[PDB]
Design a binder for this molecule. Structure first.
Ligand SMILES: O=S(=O)(Nc1nc2cc(Cl)ccc2o1)c1cc(Cl)ccc1Cl
Ligand SMILES: O=S(=O)(Nc1nc2cc(Cl)ccc2o1)c1cc(Cl)ccc1Cl
Ligand SMILES: O=S(=O)(Nc1nc2cc(Cl)ccc2o1)c1cc(Cl)ccc1Cl
Ligand SMILES: O=S(=O)(Nc1nc2cc(Cl)ccc2o1)c1cc(Cl)ccc1Cl
Ligand SMILES: [Mg+2]
Ligand SMILES: [Mg+2]
Ligand SMILES: [Mg+2]
Ligand SMILES: [Mg+2]
Lengths: 317, 317, 317, 317
């Protein structure tokens, strides 16, 4: 029997006999996504080209930014687009701290590559004045996380303590329909995703692992390669078809390139909630403890076996 | 000053003081794409999930199939989805033969990866009865070709003798707006796209080439890796950012995996019209001569220098 | 600062520290409206006309019907489209009884005239088994009522104890935006709306009133005539521009033609909540007490002064 | 077998082995309508209400204005929104003169009443320099005329020498689908449409006619009254259900209130092409000869019998 992101969220909140604050927060994020999805698909692009006569990275941030301040459920907001955390006005304060990537893979949107919105929701901890500090919780403290993928179609994957659920956006009625209830990732996959152009800077562990995929030692079948470049898209494929996604440290930043707060953590959390794993090589991504908000991190995630089979090789070095 | 795919096509046809048959054909293809784009984005998916109470590969084929027969400009139609060429009914016959892939990368649409529609338009040659034979012309005989990419947004790239033009689909008014006039590809790019999982079966030439990209000999900067798996998406990125896309022969079919008639040829033609190259390793893709309609072919295409730099290595072996 | 029907409803519910049952109910009705609005505008009509190869009164009923049973907030449902009240399955029962007109003015939808959805929500009273009886409450017992107008644009007018609010449907992002907060109707208007073809059967009171509008006795300016035929549209214009709408008893049914439960009551309630009036000639519409569910009623509603100025004449006879 | 406004227009043009200038003109008008329809339904209204942070009469005019100049098929353009005719730039000149009402019933768009776009297309006559004079042709000189109705759904009625055809706008794929081929109006209808608030100023003929409808002399059934106020909507209902629409001269302008060039003429032409009639009381609307471009005219149109039955009474006075 049919269900929607809204109906579904207020049923969970109303069942956990909660406040409703998280629900308001999520609903507001949902509206923002729909507005972003509309912009990403080139809503009224004909007008920009003078159909009547006479920056997407920004609009997205504003949508999420504005929609979240407006929910009265947020107090501190961190965004890949803002150098500093944003402190919600006093009258608009809520108990939640949100970290998000308004639009990811944006730079590559000229070639219409799948882009997406990532987000993480923590409950404010210290009773001090809400500040950037409140955002430095480890992914292990997430209350809910997820992302919206603007691909061939627009889907929103939401992971909460109760598991991971996928909602398809029906553009004809502007509603998110639940199409994959309590999702779980394959134990082992047949695909490895990473940028092999930096093959030159791969630390030994990584180079050895990739080698075992192209040329399986047990003379089995090789894995298939796939890398869209837009994380949301890659991680999502990893979640659907199973496999492993990698964006390790190298010659550049030995802490990876991806941002921990609003890129690695939400995805790790989703993965782990779906039965997968997310390690930085040394430790679990959700355990890492934030120092800076734009702090980076190495990430290897996906199907258990694959991530484990990685760590296996990681120790060997 | 604003222009659309329709306004633009009937201005070319009306300027070449032509019949208008090609125009009707293109317009019909345009409608089909809009209908496919709507389906790909999950138009009324809420209804499938019982919002009121109680296969995309197919729908696409039917849209294109029906829309083209209905144009009265086609006589013989070849589609990746039909084992045999389709012979248009006598009353609905036109002078054009069309080859198309209704939906490409379809199998990977579960993970919402960019998919697309590819197409090639030839003028019927022999005055015999229209038959599958009429479809066996070499890509060099194309009258027009192109593809529709259903990615973050829906774009339609159209290449004709007059060059290559890109139109963005404004979903708000269902019109294709011309946003990139007479496109031309970069001489050299900084990205190589291919499935490195079949690294095990790469003939020497390919392995050596990829090696020169990961580890540039002139100790320059390496290329970046990118492979979406969905041709339309990859080829399009190659056209926008420049670079090289490869899907060579191996242990499997030594004639590649891609279909020549409705995948390689249209793309080669677009590439060549934009100033790029499309070789099968031995010869230019547009020169190859069709034997079977579902005949396969190896493809290496993109920026000139890159394709040439490839062939350089190809001869070496 | 921006607000939506959802954000707005769950803020009222969450502020009245309520259950959330009413909220789920309203949200479900909201989804149904968006689905209906999509169908009314001819969503995928191209498919019905064989774009790929090979009743609205009903679809609307099913949407509302299904969406409401699915909310778990309804127990007894009455609809202009169902001869008998519908008793929600035990597992899906809620404390609310809903009366609605899935689509009004439907018969006149061939000429694309504004149509709309009307609805009334009562709280079940007797602790007996939910039955048709539970639906026989007087409009005075309404918990919330309203209607959705599918005109030049789709708007949803919601009236609750806290007043009447209007939400515009942004089709680009499928969200209902609050554009007219706590609405109130003009004291006196300059427009009278009714079907003057039945001038032959007007009881004296009505004929005299209309006369005083066409030929104002105080030799002032006449009122303007307007009658769309589709109630939702007429009543809405009455609410926006002010004035009076009439659909009195005559030679036919001396109880009017409009249905009391799901047409007159919701509108009366909205009117009265916006500062207007709704009388049957003898008494207030919200006071009338239901005998049959499809029971009819005479209605005169709109701006106070105008309705009063009517009753003035009504007594005179 | 499926057909669209575009496919249909370029089949007529291509069949009449014409230039294609009229086709380009119509196509451009079609794009403008789709853009207007999108705006009328409140496309991105959420943005106006600060969803991200921080006049329709005009936008419509600009759309049509710009889209027509851009077609290279117009030379002189008259619009209800421009005090003077507009002379297309030399490089953009075409052989056609167009008269249009970008948006009609606009003032009443606050109550979401059906609005519409009306248009008339004449072929420039004098070989002088294109000037306002070229627009003063009688409706009898029309090459094509029609209107777009933005009601419960968006339809475009197109009347040319070959008859009248109706196209429904499928918003899901932004295409106009032909749903009523070569339309013809009922000989006699059962509905009269006019503003009876001006009952006080009706010349005798009109008052007597209306009387014969409310109280049929042959003691038959009365006609039903209907008046939306927005011409496009009323005239369209008249065309679909049959009947008569009236907007006669009175105490105010004895030449009516409707504009002759871009309101009366297009509708008269459509009516007459559908088998109806359009008189000003004294003569046929299409015969009247323009003096001023914003010149007004009395109009009575619709089913033959009804219009005739009117004129019958008209002579009697
Ligand atoms: O803190 S909540 O927002 N509590 C809550 N949401 C409600 C929605 C309705 Cl309609 C009624 C009552 C609610 O309480 C919440 C939200 C979710 Cl996703 C899951 C658990 C909880 Cl605890
Ligand atoms: O064979 S055509 O279709 N000739 C043609 N198209 C017309 C469109 C109009 Cl509106 C009027 C006259 C036309 O002639 C054609 C179409 C294109 Cl894309 C480019 C060159 C030609 Cl040759
Ligand atoms: O009975 S309710 O549905 N109570 C309620 N709705 C909630 C929504 C959230 Cl997100 C959280 C708590 C809620 O409690 C309700 C709904 C409305 Cl329109 C107005 C007053 C009330 Cl009383
Ligand atoms: O003057 S036209 O525009 N001639 C014309 N239109 C064409 C479209 C195509 Cl695709 C090809 C040739 C054409 O010639 C024209 C347009 C219509 Cl609605 C009806 C008759 C005519 Cl005469
Ligand atoms: Mg990012
Ligand atoms: Mg394919
Ligand atoms: Mg009704
Ligand atoms: Mg007007």
């Amino acid at each position: 029997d049919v269900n929607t992101l809204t109906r579904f969220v207020m049923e969970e909140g109303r069942k956990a006999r909660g406040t409703g604050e998280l629900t308001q927060l999520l609903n507001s994020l949902c509206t923002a996504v729909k507005a972003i999805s509309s912009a990403v698909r080139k809503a009224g692009i004909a007008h920009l080209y003078g159909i009547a006569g006479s920056k997407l990275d920004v609009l997205s941030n504003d949508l999420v930014m504005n929609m979240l301040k407006s929910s009265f459920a947020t107090c501190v907001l961190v965004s890949e687009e803002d150098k500093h955390a944003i402190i919600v006005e006093p009258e608009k304060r809520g108990k939640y701290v949100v970290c998000f990537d308004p639009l990811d893979g944006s730079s590559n949107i000229d070639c219409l590559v799948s882009v997406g919105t990532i987000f993480g929701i923590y409950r404010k901890k210290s009773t001090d004045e809400p500040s950037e500090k409140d955002a430095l919780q480890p992914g292990r403290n997430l209350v809910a996380a997820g992302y919206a993928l603007y691909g061939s179609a627009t889907m929103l994957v939401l992971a909460m303590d109760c598991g991971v659920n996928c909602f398809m956006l029906d553009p004809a009625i502007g509603e998110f329909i639940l199409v994959d209830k309590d999702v779980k990732i394959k134990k082992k996959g047949k695909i490895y995703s990473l940028n092999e152009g930096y093959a030159k800077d791969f630390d030994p562990a990584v180079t050895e692992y990739i080698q075992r995929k192209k040329f399986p030692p047990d003379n089995s079948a090789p894995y298939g390669a796939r890398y869209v470049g837009s994380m949301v898209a890659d991680v999502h494929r990893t979640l659907v078809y199973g496999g492993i996604f990698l964006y390790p440290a190298n010659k550049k930043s030995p802490n990876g390139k991806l941002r921990l707060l609003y890129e690695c953590n939400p995805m790790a959390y989703v993965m782990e909630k779906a039965g997968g794993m997310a390690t930085t090589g040394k430790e679990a991504v959700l355990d890492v403890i934030p120092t800076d908000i734009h702090q980076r991190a190495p990430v290897i995630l996906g199907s258990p076996d694959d991530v484990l089979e990685f760590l296996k090789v990681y120790e060997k070095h």
